[PDB]
Amino acid sequence: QVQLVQSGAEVKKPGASVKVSCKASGYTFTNYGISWVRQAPGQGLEWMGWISAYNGNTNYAQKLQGRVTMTTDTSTSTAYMELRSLRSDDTAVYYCAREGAYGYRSPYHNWFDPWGQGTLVTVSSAKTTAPSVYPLAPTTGSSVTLGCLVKGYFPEPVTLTWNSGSLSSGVHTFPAVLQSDLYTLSSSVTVTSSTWPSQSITCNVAHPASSTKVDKKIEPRGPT
Amino acid sequence: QVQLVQSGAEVKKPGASVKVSCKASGYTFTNYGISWVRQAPGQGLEWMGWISAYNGNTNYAQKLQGRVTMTTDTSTSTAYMELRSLRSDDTAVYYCAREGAYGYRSPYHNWFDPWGQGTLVTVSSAKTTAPSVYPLAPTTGSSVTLGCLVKGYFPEPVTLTWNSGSLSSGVHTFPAVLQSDLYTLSSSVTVTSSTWPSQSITCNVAHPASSTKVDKKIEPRGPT
Amino acid sequence: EIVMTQSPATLSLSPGERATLSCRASQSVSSYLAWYQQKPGQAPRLLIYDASNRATGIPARFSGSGSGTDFTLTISSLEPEDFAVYYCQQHSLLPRTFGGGTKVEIKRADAAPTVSIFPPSSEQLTSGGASVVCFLNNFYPKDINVKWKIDGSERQNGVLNSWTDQDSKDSTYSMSSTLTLTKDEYERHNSYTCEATHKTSTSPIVKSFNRNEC
Amino acid sequence: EIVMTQSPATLSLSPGERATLSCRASQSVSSYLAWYQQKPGQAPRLLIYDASNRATGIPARFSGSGSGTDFTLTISSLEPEDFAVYYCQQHSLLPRTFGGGTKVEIKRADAAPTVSIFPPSSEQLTSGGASVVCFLNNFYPKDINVKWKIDGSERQNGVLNSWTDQDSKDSTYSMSSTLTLTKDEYERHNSYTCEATHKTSTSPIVKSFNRNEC
Amino acid sequence: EIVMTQSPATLSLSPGERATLSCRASQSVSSYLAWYQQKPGQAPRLLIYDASNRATGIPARFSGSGSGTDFTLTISSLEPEDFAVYYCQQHSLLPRTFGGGTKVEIKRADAAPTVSIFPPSSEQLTSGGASVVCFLNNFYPKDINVKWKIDGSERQNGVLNSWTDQDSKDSTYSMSSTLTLTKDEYERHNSYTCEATHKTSTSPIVKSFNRNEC
Amino acid sequence: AKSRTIGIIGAPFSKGQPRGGVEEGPTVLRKAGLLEKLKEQECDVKDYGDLPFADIPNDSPFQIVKNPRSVGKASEQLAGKVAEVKKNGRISLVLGGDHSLAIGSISGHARVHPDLGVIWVDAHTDINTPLTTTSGNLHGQPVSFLLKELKGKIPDVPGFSWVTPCISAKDIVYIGLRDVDPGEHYILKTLGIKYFSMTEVDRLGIGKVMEETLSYLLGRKKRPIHLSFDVDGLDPSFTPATGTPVVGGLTYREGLYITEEIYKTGLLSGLDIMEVNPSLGKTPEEVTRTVNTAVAITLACFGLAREGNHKPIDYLN
Ligand SMILES: [Mn+2]
Ligand SMILES: [Mn+2]
């Protein structure tokens, strides 16, 4: 049907931009018009530019005039958006959608009806690195959880499964946070009780952007 | 004579109220007027509303307008006080007394002359539970006391006797304190000397609101 | 909210002479207040009705005066049944506030506390708790502070002090230093200390024990 | 830059009745705006097209009104699949601003957080870092502040708080108090504290540990 | 609650030409609002009474216009006594909201901050505190962020920034990076750093000291 | 004396009106001390207890009339009890409840005095028929069963077999009407019923209204008067804790006044206090104002006059 297949999740340092492919289909192109919107995670959303595919009407937004470029490619129904002078405030998911061409032959449209799937762009100059898994997992509570910590990986994301995912109840696997040193940090919980000393439980970590895997076997130390 | 038989000691969570029965006798009713006063333990006292029994004159107090309701029942000389939107600041003894009706046919009165016996109301949402008795009782002092600890009971009160109360000199049995976890905690002392190794002494605990009894036989462990 | 202030907070006078008490107003209550006899856990019965005049079942000795800012409660023939927390209470302004508390104790010869300190039981250790309480006993007057130490380093958040009334016969006082810990915190340390401090105690009364000593 | 203001910032209503939402304009948008269904990490699909009239694949219950300053989004037959951050968005003025956020949570009985505090590993100490994180778990609603202390003296610039969505099954919430220090700062101190504070927590939930205790 | 928005938030114009200011309404106030002259710590005296017409003790140069949504405050003959936080204020809708703030500074040639960093005294160390404050001085314009570090690792929860007005004579600005620590945290570290950052500062101005260096 | 000789009949019945909660009618009026507030002046007060209201489980509806048989059984029981207390020579203080009970309250009063009059002080006429209502709620159809000029036209709705219409259309005065559905006003105009609504209340003044009301009922001949009194007929600023509040009612002053004119004829012979509902006050203060209002209304009926009430001994002694 009416879609937008976007491409694709990419990280840039502060340097060159991400020309985001925004491929259209289903609906007839240049009878409508594609725009762009940033979304930082945990934030609101800002539209940032709309072109008519009808005739090259650039029509950018405030605070980036300037920084944005947006063209058409209307052989294939794709549209594009680059950026310029990139910056760590632009750690945002970039969505494109169809505002309708505001020309003369183009039907009444106000309302963004294709929506593309998104594009994970974080403007960070850190180096792509393996994580560093730092748990423990065994003092009177009957409820004893466990988990790992995941330190210092770049970029997003990691995958955290538990006894290779077979332990599933109590699994809560967490979105990260960006360091002061521009790296990322995460963790995940599981649940046992105090009545499970024979539950050898591993976090099974995989950061595929570094293609590194840690299956951390965890053990307490000597009591008494 | 002139009295007020109240009823009755009751605890509510933050929820519904305690319509406190305040039964009058002796003096002719609706020739006078009954009021109300809270007293948190270890605190001062706040009057909180006065009705004339003559004709329904509500006349409540500040900070609870609102929260209080007060009516008459002047078939039987009782008067009543409920509350609304109850709260853990209202862990107070509620007294009713007779201010005299400030109407027109009612004698000059300023001075609260029946006083009722009180009503133990603590607004706590904890669960009614047994206590948990935690002593010891056997390092150069000739004076050796002893006692127990009473942990985690609800509501008030416990009873603490010593060798079933037969040990009586040195008995000092203590008002509790409300936990951070909304439960109650107490203890009691007794006295021996260092010259009484053959005085097997028990705290004899009974929390009748849970109807649970612990008679804790206490013994020291191995020295040298 | 006229604040009624009772100038004798505590009182300790022997069976004997006058026990004149004071209650002050922040405005002119003007002969419009009363006096009460709150025995512990009882009905705070009326003593004196309108700043004077001795209501209806009052024995003989409960005169008082006022009119109109700072009032008097005279207990002339003291009568040792009368040992109760007393309250003045203003009336003719809303809201109708009270006094603070006029604990009428017994005056006697200052008694020294008998102080020692007590461990958690093995029956407690099978339950998994620690409750190290010191037990203070037969002293006069009320005021003792008791300090605890983790083998020399002080303790709170378990420590609770709780006092009774004055005794009927020997007329003394009360405190447990009700402290609760964990079994783990219990097993890591031995020398558990209780430092009493009473007026009769010229030196602060320290009683201690090691874990696995008793 | 007409600012679109959504008067319900958050929302927590059970599977059930109407969930009427509000969005206001700083001018007269005049029946020229829409309504969206941004599920977390998804396509913010259209709910209502031009202040009314229910576009093209909308189920049954997504009426709304406006025309022309302060508009309505009614969710009459609530249908618990619809728990998403909602957005109004003005259109017919440039530049085309958005609303703020209309997080439609689940209304349930307020859950208390399970809170405890966790050290750096020796595997971390061989790497040379310190990451003392407290872990908060299964509560409702969202709002908890967690304080840290250097044996009693507070901490920041490592401290990070991060929350998930509401859970599918038990419908609860999330926080780690993600704090990072140095191994040197780790070894100089023992009693590391985590002070939670939730609405269910009448007292601020403090959980602590000494270094070299666990 | 009609929000009144002042489009010039800050203002810095020399003694000289017009200083036309803007205040916008969220509705039609329609020539029903005023203009004020809040000097620091003073009476926010009326400038312009009903969107015009210059009330009763106004000097010469305080014309303004409106009627009825986005209004003007013209200061044509600037007169450097007039350097005050200005306020528009709507009136004829309840409740009667205000503007945001229109700090009229002095326009001058951008001054560079004189920056250095200062320890706790031994007189403080006998009291047991630590207060390491950096002191920033004689700059223009206002905006400086100052970072602290625990020998290289950043600091907050003591750090406080506080600015004066613009000076009368040299017309400059102000900040202390008011930071407070503990004596224990003081003694564990030496190299205490203050990183200023002003517009005149092309590089962030770092001034430091070791403990037991001065 | 002749007046202020009271038989109290509490009647906690609800099924004529839909808002359940008026069955705490006599309970709240008694716990507000209506008995003892009578007993200062020379009130021969004899409580006869509350009437038992049995529950017909299959009280199947009529076409529009719903819960009919419970209403009819309750009003027949009350007609027997009102006839009992009027054979006791007292003034029937029948307080509920709802206006469904006023059927038997006027019926048993007519069983002793067949030529009485009805002062139906109410916001509404309550004279809908079983056929031409749109509610079918019997808290607004008591008067249609009672007028002889409506006979042969009222259906045989079950529970109402005992009902004999007993009062004449020229022997009833409405005072304080302010919301009438069209069927009731056609009945009101075709029968030639005399009425003083809030129009005519304000026109003559409440005193000239009570003057002409007593000139209409008692100006021909002295006869017993049956004040049946709703508490929504007053303005909801004074009684918001009623079943059907309509704004624009009588002031509380004038309600007390209407009761005092009925007293100073010396011909009060039957009293109804209906539609008191403590469950509908948004605050208990609203309930407190409503119940103190209705209590003092009942006081000023039996001669707690606002001028004064006395016992005939010298008080300078
Ligand atoms: Mn009505
Ligand atoms: Mn009616």
Author numbering:
A (entry chain D), B (entry chain Q): 1 to 138, 143 to 228
C (entry chain O), D (entry chain E), E (entry chain P): 1 to 214
F (entry chain J): 3 to 319
Published text:
Approximately 80% of all complexes identified were composed of two hArg1 trimers and three mAb1s, forming a 2:3 complex, while the remaining 20% of complexes were composed of two hArg1 trimers and two mAb1s (hereafter called a 2:2 complex). Although the resolution of the map was lower (3.6 Å for 2:3 versus 4.1 Å for 2:2), the high-quality map allowed for both the two hArg1 trimers and two mAbs to be manually positioned. In this smaller complex, the angle between the Fabs is only ~60° and results in the two hArg1 trimers being positioned significantly closer together. The epitope and paratope interactions between each Fab and hArg1 monomers are identical to the 2:3 complex, however one set of interactions is absent due to having only two mAb1s present. Here, Fab1 binds to both monomer A and monomer B, Fab1ʹ binds to monomers B and C, but the Fab that would bind across the monomer C and A is absent. Here, both monomer B and monomer C are inhibited by the HC CDR-3 loops of Fab1 and Fab1ʹ, respectively, while the active site of monomer A remains open and uninhibited. Here it is apparent that that arrangement of the antibodies is quite asymmetric and only one monomer (monomer B here) makes all three mAb interactions (mAb1 LC and HC; and mAb2 HC) as seen in the 2:3 complex. d Two surface representations show both a side view and a top view of this 2:2 complex.
